[PDB]
Design a protein around this nucleic acid. Sequence first.
DNA 1: GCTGATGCGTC
DNA 2: GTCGGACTG
DNA 3: CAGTCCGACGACGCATCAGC
Length: 632
Amino acid sequence: DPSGYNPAKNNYHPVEDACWKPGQKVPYLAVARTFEKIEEVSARLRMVETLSNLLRSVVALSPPDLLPVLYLSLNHLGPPQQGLELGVGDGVLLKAVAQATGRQLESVRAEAAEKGDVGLVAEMLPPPPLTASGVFSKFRDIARLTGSASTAKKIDIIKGLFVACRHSEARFIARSLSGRLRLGLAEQSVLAALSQAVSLTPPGQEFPPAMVDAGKGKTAEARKTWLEEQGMILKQTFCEVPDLDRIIPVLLEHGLERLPEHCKLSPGIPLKPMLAHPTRGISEVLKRFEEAAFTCEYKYDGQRAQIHALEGGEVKIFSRNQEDNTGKYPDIISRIPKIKLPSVTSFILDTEAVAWDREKKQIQPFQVLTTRKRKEVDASEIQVQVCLYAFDLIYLNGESLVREPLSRRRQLLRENFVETEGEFVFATSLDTKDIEQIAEFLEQSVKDSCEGLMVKTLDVDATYEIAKRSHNWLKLKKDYLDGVGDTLDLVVIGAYLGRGKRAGRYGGFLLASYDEDSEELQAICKLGTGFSDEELEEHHQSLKALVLPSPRPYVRIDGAVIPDHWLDPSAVWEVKCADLSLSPIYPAARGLVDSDKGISLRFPRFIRVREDKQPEQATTSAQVACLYRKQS
DNA sequence: GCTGATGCGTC
DNA sequence: GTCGGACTG
DNA sequence: CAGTCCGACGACGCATCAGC
Ligand SMILES: *OP(=O)(O)OC[C@H]1O[C@@H](n2cnc3c(N)ncnc32)[C@H](O)[C@@H]1O
């Protein structure tokens, strides 16, 4: 009985402690009971082990369900570059729920907002019990339902799913659709749990499996290490082929050990991008790399563009998330041929797309960049031109460069490509360990419009193996190598109820500057981070008192999300941020830099209260108007 | 056929 | 993109 | 102490669908 299924048990025997029949279909209730047991717990290690247990039973018992089960725990419809979308929102989900509960949208709505978890507002001849595999496909059905009137159709399935739910199934199905599963394990851990499962109870065995715990006899530490070694195998592979549709069947078919031999990098499938650690300044950069020659480069403020040239001539570009941006970029593709040497048969390029002034001949702001149509490659309709900045070469003429040093890689890159100003050009690099030198670069970097500096090592810990270290590169961000970036004092003019972790307190706030010509507090931006847990809990108390049933006459939100609660304006906070932009939603300093747009803060973060300031001695609209003005 | 509201991806 | 908190190394 | 990993939260602008 799956209602008693307990993947968190001790001496879990895959065959025995399973709660379905061999070769039969994995029950969702099993998947939910697992989710339950994981959430019961804090130890990531315990959580992975539990997930592992369901997994080992899936492998041993019902291999074809492994994929669905994985996707379910990952809460994803499928491969990134397939771009499936639930297309339910909160509100659709909401009405679905109210319908199924025989409640009214409001009561339901209220309860969800307050409890901060749709899953709880979520809980005759009921259908047969929900199958793990069935649930996923129903999800995939919802997603597929597009175009006109499709919403009611989407609602139909959800409600069905709900009426079908047997125990806690409801809440978990609710959260999934809500896009807020809250499991505590995502890609790494699920990857982890998969590796373990497949390592402890291998696929391929006639039933029942004569090898049920490959770890037996290993001491604990021993079993740990061994497990982590196996882990890296799967983990590095997914990295080059981050696509379960691909991995799993191969895994199941050849086992973890030989997985790599049968799953490789190939242009046309996106691979996971190398990431970056934030650095507190040159000091620490030199320390981290204090025994490793490194390079410096401009951190261009564009979007990342993985360029794939297939030997057959076609070419696909992917986002930081393996999303298919081919189509975004008709202009890029036609320019591909003049980008490479004749001998170059195939390549995978690491690049930033940047908004470009073919006229003024200069990098335009990232906002400019975001103005291009996403879908159509009506290549003539391109109002905003783009320039690619190259900085890495993953793969070249049949061969993967993944296991090569940045040195080798970059060299190959320069040696085989051909730049054209404002079209395609190598990132400005600098090779030093000189403190002042670096600082100089950093300033020139912002002086040529760049977030600042990337710092990468050249031949020490310097390959493209993300499984060893994703954030393997460092960024020096003007912010604190400056000393202290844009920072304002703003007035808290309303809270928003928080969810999940933020559940049951305030999740966020609405902040206003002070316009004195209007003599009113203009909502500037929302604020949702920077505070500690404690800090928050303290905030929740005081502000609680200040909740008013209406706004003050001097408060001006417009386009802004009506606070959940309106606060009595008194709290001034001190906020940092990376930049400024003309908001089409924010009144603060409207008319001052734009005739229409106000301005907001970019990457806003709470820093501390200024318990001396009153809201009128907050930061000022022309003060903001000032800051924005200085930006360019 | 248009407007507003929100999805969903970019940072 | 930004951020803290629990848990491991 | 440091690094992992997960999930709270930001402003924006194109795309999409309901309701008119
Ligand atoms: O801030 P972040 O953590 O999102 O930074 C990583 C991103 O920075 C962009 N970028 C710009 N220039 C470079 C160079 N020269 N090297 C590596 N990344 C660079 C990328 O879009 C990256 O995802």
